[PDB]
């Protein structure tokens, strides 16, 4: 059931979590990507990525405040995906699609990998 | 907004 | 903007955060309401409520792992609102609307107070 | 799902 639903609720929650990230409020992890640092909320990362879900459900790794990703990872690709996690918007361009796809495969972001493969197949 | 889910 | 958007992203993030709450994963606060305890994620509470936003942006209160609410607050009303925070769905019924509205006013959940006032005005 | 925002 006898529920009502607020259509904009989930997107408003995301917008507010992105504002907390922008102001560095309650961020609890630093992700390091080829010497560049990105602050974030562990719960948002886990909710969006198979890799972060595996890391932060691990009894040892859940205690870490700094996570280093493989240095071959493209930090612009990571930044594009982190923005997607917090906004639902993916800035996919001809010049970044290969890097974004590789990063999404590494992060285990299935829907993102799916859309990249579709855009690449349409280009060929 | 409010709707029927 | 040159973005694409994943329609279900924000609701999938909420569904996953609700699954973390159900499994007690990375919950970082206990809310106590008339001797009943509710575990949650501070960031989700802040994103949904003016009261929790004020508490967890305070330099002293942000360190607390237990928050006691006014004991006159109805814990069923709180539980209904916590479920709304994590699902966008509000279980509003004739038998709980007055308690839900009072709790939403206390929590500073403006859109919820708005819909309660509308349903009450339609009933009179 | 993927759409134009
Ligand atoms: C493979 N993969 C993927 O594409 N996304 C978007 C994923 C998200 C999560 N996480 C969760 N799944 C179930 C319950 C809770 C969470 C959280 N937080 C794990 C794997 C994912
Ligand atoms: C009055 N009120 C209300 O109805 N909702 C749903 C509210 C949410 C928040 N929170 C935020 N606002 C701006 C930036 C970040 C956050 C977070 N987290 C504060 C007051 C609210």
Short mmCIF file of C-alpha atoms and ligand atoms in Angstrom, two decimals:
data_model
loop_
_atom_site.label_atom_id
_atom_site.label_comp_id
_atom_site.label_asym_id
_atom_site.label_seq_id
_atom_site.Cartn_x
_atom_site.Cartn_y
_atom_site.Cartn_z
CA UNK A 1 2.11 -3.09 -0.92
CA UNK A 2 0.00 0.00 0.00
CA UNK A 3 3.07 2.28 -0.59
CA UNK A 4 3.51 5.59 -2.42
CA UNK A 5 6.83 6.37 -4.06
CA UNK A 6 8.79 9.64 -4.47
CA UNK A 7 10.05 9.49 -8.10
CA UNK A 8 13.09 11.75 -7.55
CA UNK A 9 14.15 10.16 -4.24
CA UNK A 10 16.93 7.86 -5.48
CA UNK A 11 18.45 10.57 -7.76
CA UNK A 12 18.19 13.18 -4.92
CA UNK A 13 20.04 10.76 -2.59
CA UNK A 14 22.79 10.40 -5.25
CA UNK A 15 22.96 14.20 -5.81
CA UNK A 16 23.34 14.74 -2.04
CA UNK A 17 26.02 12.01 -1.72
CA UNK A 18 27.90 13.70 -4.62
CA UNK A 19 27.66 17.05 -2.77
CA UNK A 20 29.12 15.31 0.36
CA UNK A 21 31.94 13.92 -1.82
CA UNK A 22 32.61 17.43 -3.31
CA UNK A 23 32.84 18.92 0.23
CA UNK A 24 34.85 15.92 1.58
CA UNK A 25 32.12 15.14 4.15
CA UNK A 26 32.23 11.61 5.68
CA UNK A 27 34.48 10.31 2.85
CA UNK A 28 36.16 7.24 4.35
CA UNK A 29 38.55 5.99 1.67
CA UNK A 30 41.21 7.37 -0.67
CA UNK A 31 41.55 5.51 -4.00
CA UNK A 32 45.04 5.95 -5.51
CA UNK A 33 45.38 5.63 -9.29
CA UNK A 34 48.88 6.19 -10.80
CA UNK A 35 49.80 8.69 -7.99
CA UNK A 36 46.47 10.53 -8.19
CA UNK A 37 44.14 10.45 -5.19
CA UNK A 38 40.33 10.27 -5.20
CA UNK A 39 38.28 10.56 -2.01
CA UNK A 40 34.99 8.67 -1.81
CA UNK A 41 32.43 6.84 0.31
CA UNK A 42 33.07 3.06 0.58
CA UNK A 43 29.32 2.25 0.51
CA UNK A 44 28.80 4.09 -2.82
CA UNK A 45 31.84 2.30 -4.34
CA UNK A 46 30.51 -1.14 -3.16
CA UNK A 47 27.01 -0.40 -4.48
CA UNK A 48 28.46 0.36 -7.97
CA UNK A 49 31.35 -2.06 -8.46
CA UNK A 50 32.00 -5.78 -8.12
CA UNK A 51 35.65 -5.09 -7.32
CA UNK A 52 34.88 -2.59 -4.49
CA UNK A 53 32.09 -4.88 -3.19
CA UNK A 54 34.72 -7.72 -2.93
CA UNK A 55 37.32 -5.44 -1.25
CA UNK A 56 35.06 -3.82 1.37
CA UNK A 57 33.26 -7.09 2.35
CA UNK A 58 36.72 -8.61 3.09
CA UNK A 59 37.38 -8.71 6.87
CA UNK A 60 40.97 -7.30 6.44
CA UNK A 61 40.54 -4.85 3.55
CA UNK A 62 37.37 -3.26 4.97
CA UNK A 63 39.71 -1.54 7.57
CA UNK A 64 41.91 0.15 4.94
CA UNK A 65 41.59 3.94 4.47
CA UNK A 66 43.77 3.88 1.27
CA UNK A 67 43.24 1.49 -1.69
CA UNK A 68 45.83 1.41 -4.49
CA UNK A 69 44.54 0.33 -7.88
CA UNK A 70 46.74 -1.33 -10.57
CA UNK A 71 48.99 1.54 -11.90
CA UNK A 72 48.10 0.67 -15.51
CA UNK A 73 44.61 1.95 -14.79
CA UNK A 74 43.82 5.20 -16.46
CA UNK A 75 42.91 7.81 -13.76
CA UNK A 76 40.77 9.81 -16.26
CA UNK A 77 38.90 6.52 -16.90
CA UNK A 78 38.58 6.02 -13.14
CA UNK A 79 37.38 9.65 -12.65
CA UNK A 80 34.73 9.22 -15.42
CA UNK A 81 33.50 6.01 -13.70
CA UNK A 82 33.53 7.55 -10.19
CA UNK A 83 31.42 10.45 -11.59
CA UNK A 84 29.05 7.83 -13.12
CA UNK A 85 28.77 6.10 -9.70
CA UNK A 86 27.66 9.34 -8.08
CA UNK A 87 25.50 10.74 -10.93
CA UNK A 88 24.24 7.93 -13.23
CA UNK A 89 25.88 9.91 -16.10
CA UNK A 90 28.76 8.39 -18.09
CA UNK A 91 30.90 10.78 -20.12
CA UNK A 92 31.68 8.30 -22.95
CA UNK A 93 33.59 9.77 -25.95
CA UNK A 94 35.43 8.36 -28.99
CA UNK A 95 38.75 9.42 -27.34
CA UNK A 96 38.11 7.73 -23.97
CA UNK A 97 35.89 4.67 -24.69
CA UNK A 98 38.77 2.13 -24.81
CA UNK A 99 40.17 3.41 -21.46
CA UNK A 100 36.68 3.62 -19.89
CA UNK A 101 35.85 0.08 -21.01
CA UNK A 102 39.17 -1.33 -19.67
CA UNK A 103 38.62 0.47 -16.34
CA UNK A 104 34.96 -0.76 -16.07
CA UNK A 105 36.13 -4.35 -16.77
CA UNK A 106 38.74 -3.97 -13.96
CA UNK A 107 36.14 -2.45 -11.61
CA UNK A 108 33.54 -5.11 -12.56
CA UNK A 109 30.87 -2.59 -13.61
CA UNK A 110 28.83 -4.92 -15.87
CA UNK A 111 26.25 -2.46 -17.28
CA UNK A 112 29.05 -0.01 -18.19
CA UNK A 113 31.08 -2.77 -19.95
CA UNK A 114 27.82 -3.71 -21.82
CA UNK A 115 27.23 -0.14 -23.16
CA UNK A 116 30.93 0.25 -24.14
CA UNK A 117 30.81 -3.02 -26.13
CA UNK A 118 27.62 -1.83 -27.88
CA UNK A 119 29.15 1.56 -28.86
CA UNK A 120 32.35 -0.16 -30.11
CA UNK A 121 30.33 -2.73 -32.19
CA UNK A 122 28.29 0.20 -33.72
CA UNK A 123 31.61 1.97 -34.66
CA UNK A 124 32.87 -1.11 -36.62
CA UNK B 1 6.52 14.00 -7.33
CA UNK B 2 4.66 11.24 -5.44
CA UNK B 3 3.32 8.29 -7.44
CA UNK B 4 1.87 4.80 -7.22
CA UNK B 5 4.87 2.38 -7.47
CA UNK C 1 27.20 17.37 -21.84
CA UNK C 2 27.98 14.44 -24.21
CA UNK C 3 26.89 11.94 -21.47
CA UNK C 4 24.70 8.82 -21.55
CA UNK C 5 22.69 7.89 -18.48
CA UNK C 6 21.77 4.50 -16.93
CA UNK C 7 18.08 4.93 -15.95
CA UNK C 8 18.12 2.32 -13.15
CA UNK C 9 21.47 3.41 -11.66
CA UNK C 10 20.23 5.54 -8.74
CA UNK C 11 17.55 2.95 -7.72
CA UNK C 12 20.11 0.09 -8.06
CA UNK C 13 22.51 2.03 -5.76
CA UNK C 14 19.67 2.39 -3.21
CA UNK C 15 18.70 -1.31 -3.51
CA UNK C 16 22.35 -2.31 -2.91
CA UNK C 17 22.70 0.08 0.08
CA UNK C 18 19.49 -1.47 1.53
CA UNK C 19 21.00 -4.95 1.06
CA UNK C 20 24.14 -3.74 2.95
CA UNK C 21 21.88 -2.41 5.72
CA UNK C 22 19.97 -5.78 5.88
CA UNK C 23 23.31 -7.68 6.22
CA UNK C 24 24.77 -5.07 8.65
CA UNK C 25 27.65 -4.30 6.23
CA UNK C 26 29.52 -1.01 6.86
CA UNK C 27 26.65 0.37 9.02
CA UNK C 28 28.29 3.06 11.14
CA UNK C 29 25.56 4.35 13.43
CA UNK C 30 22.86 2.97 15.73
CA UNK C 31 19.73 5.16 16.02
CA UNK C 32 17.86 4.53 19.31
CA UNK C 33 14.12 5.24 19.38
CA UNK C 34 12.26 4.48 22.67
CA UNK C 35 14.70 1.61 23.53
CA UNK C 36 14.61 0.15 20.00
CA UNK C 37 17.80 0.14 17.94
CA UNK C 38 18.15 0.71 14.19
CA UNK C 39 21.46 0.27 12.36
CA UNK C 40 22.15 2.47 9.34
CA UNK C 41 24.67 4.30 7.17
CA UNK C 42 25.27 7.93 8.26
CA UNK C 43 25.62 9.12 4.62
CA UNK C 44 22.18 7.74 3.64
CA UNK C 45 20.59 9.36 6.73
CA UNK C 46 22.23 12.77 5.90
CA UNK C 47 21.16 12.55 2.25
CA UNK C 48 17.49 12.04 3.32
CA UNK C 49 17.00 14.19 6.42
CA UNK C 50 17.67 17.76 7.50
CA UNK C 51 18.06 16.61 11.11
CA UNK C 52 20.67 13.91 10.28
CA UNK C 53 22.44 16.30 7.88
CA UNK C 54 22.76 18.81 10.82
CA UNK C 55 23.96 16.10 13.27
CA UNK C 56 26.59 14.44 11.06
CA UNK C 57 28.06 17.75 9.72
CA UNK C 58 28.64 18.81 13.37
CA UNK C 59 32.33 18.41 14.34
CA UNK C 60 31.43 16.70 17.71
CA UNK C 61 28.36 14.65 16.77
CA UNK C 62 29.89 13.24 13.57
CA UNK C 63 32.07 11.01 15.90
CA UNK C 64 29.09 9.41 17.68
CA UNK C 65 28.27 5.75 16.90
CA UNK C 66 24.91 5.94 18.82
CA UNK C 67 22.28 8.69 18.32
CA UNK C 68 19.27 8.81 20.69
CA UNK C 69 16.15 10.40 19.26
CA UNK C 70 13.45 12.11 21.42
CA UNK C 71 11.64 9.19 23.22
CA UNK C 72 8.23 10.56 22.16
CA UNK C 73 9.12 9.57 18.61
CA UNK C 74 7.21 6.62 17.33
CA UNK C 75 9.69 3.83 16.35
CA UNK C 76 7.20 2.36 13.81
CA UNK C 77 7.07 5.87 12.28
CA UNK C 78 10.88 5.98 12.30
CA UNK C 79 11.10 2.46 10.75
CA UNK C 80 8.64 3.47 7.96
CA UNK C 81 10.78 6.58 7.24
CA UNK C 82 14.10 4.66 7.36
CA UNK C 83 12.60 2.17 4.84
CA UNK C 84 11.57 5.17 2.67
CA UNK C 85 15.16 6.53 2.85
CA UNK C 86 16.53 3.25 1.51
CA UNK C 87 13.76 2.42 -1.00
CA UNK C 88 11.88 5.58 -2.12
CA UNK C 89 8.69 3.78 -0.94
CA UNK C 90 6.61 5.20 1.93
CA UNK C 91 4.17 2.85 3.62
CA UNK C 92 1.55 5.54 4.45
CA UNK C 93 -1.74 4.23 5.94
CA UNK C 94 -4.78 5.77 7.69
CA UNK C 95 -3.55 4.20 10.98
CA UNK C 96 0.02 5.56 10.80
CA UNK C 97 -0.18 8.89 8.89
CA UNK C 98 -0.30 11.12 12.02
CA UNK C 99 2.77 9.33 13.53
CA UNK C 100 4.61 9.30 10.17
CA UNK C 101 3.94 13.02 9.66
CA UNK C 102 5.12 13.92 13.21
CA UNK C 103 8.28 11.82 12.72
CA UNK C 104 9.00 13.39 9.25
CA UNK C 105 8.58 16.89 10.76
CA UNK C 106 11.08 15.93 13.53
CA UNK C 107 13.49 14.43 10.96
CA UNK C 108 13.06 17.44 8.61
CA UNK C 109 12.00 15.34 5.60
CA UNK C 110 10.18 18.10 3.66
CA UNK C 111 8.76 16.10 0.73
CA UNK C 112 7.36 13.49 3.15
CA UNK C 113 5.71 16.20 5.33
CA UNK C 114 4.26 17.68 2.06
CA UNK C 115 2.61 14.36 0.98
CA UNK C 116 1.27 13.71 4.51
CA UNK C 117 -0.36 17.18 4.61
CA UNK C 118 -1.92 16.52 1.18
CA UNK C 119 -3.38 13.13 2.24
CA UNK C 120 -4.73 14.63 5.51
CA UNK C 121 -6.34 17.61 3.63
CA UNK C 122 -7.98 15.11 1.16
CA UNK C 123 -9.39 13.12 4.17
CA UNK C 124 -11.13 16.25 5.61
CA UNK D 1 18.69 0.75 -19.90
CA UNK D 2 21.01 3.46 -21.28
CA UNK D 3 19.46 6.74 -22.43
CA UNK D 4 20.17 10.31 -23.45
CA UNK D 5 19.90 12.42 -20.23
C1 LIG E 1 29.32 -7.07 -10.75
N1 LIG E 1 28.68 -5.90 -10.17
C2 LIG E 1 28.20 -4.81 -10.87
O1 LIG E 1 28.24 -4.64 -12.07
N2 LIG E 1 27.65 -3.96 -9.93
C3 LIG E 1 27.02 -2.68 -10.21
C4 LIG E 1 27.77 -4.51 -8.66
C5 LIG E 1 27.39 -4.04 -7.42
C6 LIG E 1 27.72 -4.81 -6.31
N3 LIG E 1 27.22 -4.84 -5.03
C7 LIG E 1 26.23 -5.29 -4.24
N4 LIG E 1 25.58 -6.38 -4.65
C8 LIG E 1 24.71 -6.96 -3.81
C9 LIG E 1 24.44 -6.48 -2.56
C10 LIG E 1 25.08 -5.34 -2.14
C11 LIG E 1 25.99 -4.69 -2.96
C12 LIG E 1 26.59 -3.47 -2.48
N5 LIG E 1 27.02 -2.52 -2.06
C13 LIG E 1 28.41 -6.01 -6.46
C14 LIG E 1 28.75 -6.48 -7.71
C15 LIG E 1 28.43 -5.72 -8.82
C1 LIG E 2 15.43 19.61 4.79
N1 LIG E 2 15.94 18.45 4.07
C2 LIG E 2 15.18 17.50 3.42
O1 LIG E 2 13.97 17.46 3.35
N2 LIG E 2 16.07 16.61 2.85
C3 LIG E 2 15.72 15.44 2.06
C4 LIG E 2 17.37 17.00 3.14
C5 LIG E 2 18.59 16.44 2.80
C6 LIG E 2 19.74 17.04 3.30
N3 LIG E 2 21.05 16.97 2.90
C7 LIG E 2 21.97 17.43 2.04
N4 LIG E 2 21.74 18.63 1.48
C8 LIG E 2 22.71 19.19 0.75
C9 LIG E 2 23.92 18.61 0.53
C10 LIG E 2 24.16 17.36 1.06
C11 LIG E 2 23.20 16.72 1.84
C12 LIG E 2 23.50 15.40 2.33
N5 LIG E 2 23.78 14.37 2.68
C13 LIG E 2 19.65 18.17 4.11
C14 LIG E 2 18.43 18.74 4.40
C15 LIG E 2 17.29 18.14 3.91
#
